[PDB]
Amino acid sequence: VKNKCVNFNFNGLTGTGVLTKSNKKFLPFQQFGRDIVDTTDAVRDPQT
């Protein structure tokens, strides 16, 4: 479910927040996301 506050357990990465579609350019080997202060930003859906 997107555009709604949900607890996520993406591949063992636990957390809380809101998810949606993105236009990122993940390289095929890229799996996680982060920012300049090292906080997980984007998670590649393991089943999508």
Binding site: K24, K25, F26, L27, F29, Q30, Q31, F32, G33, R34, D35, I36, D41, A42
Partner: peptide, 24 residues
């Protein structure tokens, strides 16, 4: 047979340390 001449690597041989996307 083979040779063992020496050259400079210049700026080359940098990989992605992790599998974590980053921008700007």
């Amino acid at each position: 047979t083979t040779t063992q001449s020496y050259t400079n690597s210049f700026t080359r041989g940098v990989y992605y340390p992790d599998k974590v996307f980053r921008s700007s």
